[model samples]
Target chain A: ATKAVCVLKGDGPVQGIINFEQKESNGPVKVWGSIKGLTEGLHGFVGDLGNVTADKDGVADVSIEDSVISLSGDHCIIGRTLVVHE
Target chain B: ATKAVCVLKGDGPVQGIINFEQKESNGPVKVWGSIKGLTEGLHGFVGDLGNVTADKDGVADVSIEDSVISLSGDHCIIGRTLVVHE
Candidate 1:
């Protein structure tokens, strides 16, 4: 029970998927994903992670370790939303 | 069958609730809500709706009519996420 994912879909060419994995319950989580259709530069992918950088083709290759969010326990983001904003 | 609500909670200082209603099953949705702890100025409240403007005290009183989403039908956003992006 240490794995989860969020599939992001929005209007006008926005789509992506994020993978979450943790080694132990309530431990820090590892996040990685690929997102597209975003403006160039750093876009805030809040709730909550560092900014994601979109390339010239609007594709973002994401990888990070977050201590705040978990795949289990009370801090689970299983039903949460991952937002990509300007 | 023509109403729904989303309660938003995030780390840091993010919290809000959005209420949605429609006169008909597939009719345009009337959206209104109050959000707090957002930075001043306009914030992207998409998936999909117009941006919400936060006042100086980090409050955004939101109201709008959205035609893309509905309370019933194939276009329903019942289980979808409402994101307030920066």
Candidate 2:
């Protein structure tokens, strides 16, 4: 289950909707899972939040100019939202 | 574990594998972890590099656009891999 829906453009007051997961074995990529109640400024949250990075129509084209969280919260501050499926 | 492989096309000989991870904290996402060990020339690597976006049948789509890295190394070259297990 892969889903996406984050509408907080930022400028202060970005709320919640945290969920992430990285799957694979042997080496690296290992956060597993998370789900938090989001509510700050703009609001929106879907399920199956895991790994994010989308294109080819699925959307998820996140670009925070070298993200990985310079600030903010929810999940994937850096890469932003893309991966989600458990 | 979610897994995918890559073949490279950039020129020269890069080789090896690296892993990456991202988790959630509250509003946006957060950086998690990574593993290093890669070769130049663009050879290859495997076993859940982590958090790549894809669809239709899980293609694991990735974008180097506006990346989070400027230098070279292993794992999330600035939002490189995704979440992998141990």
Candidate 3:
């Protein structure tokens, strides 16, 4: 099952769009992750962003790419979420 | 169903923003995919772009538009992930 959560803050909502993909590694490594939609009436898009990555050695590593998200409502910013494999 | 994957490589992370639409062609086609959030201090976003597209025959196709990603912190590059139906 796949799920994404988005916040509703800021003025009129932080509306935009993005593309996503799934990854597989021939090197015994796998990755996975998730994202939250933007919130309207807010002034920022950062903090609380979550993600994770797993390797072939059965190890899961976590990371937060950015806590400082600046969006102009035109350009899109890509972020990583998770990795599962190994 | 949709899924996507991404990776963190170089100087904090490399990120690309993209727009996705559930493409439905009168001819024959459908698409789907996923992505990952970024990491800190890795300054690169590549080697893990994931996407998928499924067709009426239940046959699926996948793609990794970039591992050789060159997304500046502000510029968002568009990547092809999946194309589900055809």
Give TM-score values for chain A, per-prediction: 0.18, 0.15, 0.17
**lDDT (C-alpha) at residue B80 in model 1:** 32
Candidate 3 docking class = incorrect
lDDT of 1 at B11: 21
- Report residue B71 deviation for candidate 2 (angstroms): 28
lDDT, candidate 2, residue B79? 50
Q: Model 2 segments beyond 4 Å from truth?
A: A8-12, A15-19, A25-86, B1-86
Instruction: Give one digit per residue, the lDDT tens place, for model 2 in B1-86.
Output: 12432322332222222333433322222233222222222222222333434333222345433233333332322354355434
Q: Candidate 2 chain B: minimum summed lDDT over ten consecutive residues — where?
A: B34-43
**Between candidates 1 and 2, the DockQ winner:** 2
Docking class of 2: incorrect
Candidate 3: global Cα-lDDT? 0.29
In terms of TM-score, the best-performing candidate is: 3
The digit string of per-residue lDDT tens for model 1 on A36-71 reads: 222322224223223333222222223121323213
Instruction: Provide the RMSD of all predictions against the true structure, rounded to 1 decimal.
Output: 25.5, 26.6, 24.4
Candidate 1: where is the Cα deviation over 4 Å?
A1-14, A28-86, B1-49, B53-86
Chain A TM-score of prediction number 3: 0.17
Per-residue accuracy of model 1 over B1-86 as CA lDDT, tens digit each: 12212222332221222222223232222222332222322234212223333222222222121323113323222223555447
Tens digit of per-residue lDDT, candidate 3, span A1-86: 14432322222212223453323311111223333233223233334433333222222222222122234433454443222234
Model 2 has a clash total of 46
